[PDB]
Amino acid sequence: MTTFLIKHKASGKFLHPKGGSSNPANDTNLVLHSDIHERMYFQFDVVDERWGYIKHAASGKIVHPLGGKADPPNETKLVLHQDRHDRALFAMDFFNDNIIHKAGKYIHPKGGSTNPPNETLTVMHGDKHKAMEFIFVSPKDKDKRVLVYV
């Protein structure tokens, strides 16, 4: 079971549930926050080769694009929800350092800042740049990349 932190490469902030709860409600926004604590730990459950569910370790809820478009448009907010469904499939690209949804868009901080402030929402967007890059690091060492597929 590899528990990891999802670190925004450009700012050093991390993916958090909005509120930091061990049990965020369904459709709780996924934000960037500088803090580190067990309630921002994630896991990845491989489903089909590169594709799987990004799972909030404390609640078991997984990352979803808000709604059910399957092919979400740019600026679609990312949330947590207990449901498992194909539209919640992502890949964790540790070679290009990004997170790609099954329909081909990536997780971004909303607005594209290299230094997004705490509580900035995350959204889907097709663009590629240094501000949408994320790396996956050890909870006991924020500079140690860990393999999220194992």
Ligand X SMILES: OC[C@H]1O[C@@H](O)[C@H](O)[C@@H](O)[C@H]1O
Ligand Y SMILES: OC[C@H]1O[C@@H](O[C@H]2[C@H](O)[C@@H](O)[C@@H](O)O[C@@H]2CO)[C@H](O)[C@@H](O)[C@H]1O
* Binding residue positions: 16, 19, 27, 35-37, 64, 67, 75, 83-85, 108, 111, 119, 127-129
The two structure tokens encoding residue 116? 């997004």
3-state secondary structure 94-118: CCCCEEEECCCCEEEECCCCCCCCC
Ranges assigned E (strand) in 24-119: 28-33, 42-48, 51-56, 62-65, 78-81, 90-93, 98-101, 106-109
Binding site residues for D-galactose, as ranges?
16, 19, 27, 35-37, 64, 67, 75, 83-85, 108, 111, 119, 127-129
Whose Cβ is closer to a second copy: residue 80's or residue 124's?
A: 80
* Member of 73, 74, 84, 129 binding a second copy (CB under 8 A): 84
Least distance (Å) between residue 95 CB and ligand Y: 20
Stretch that binds a second copy, among 78-86, 101-109, 121-129 (CB under 8 A): 78-86
For strand 14-17 and strand 28-33, is the pairing parallel, antiparallel, or unpaired? antiparallel
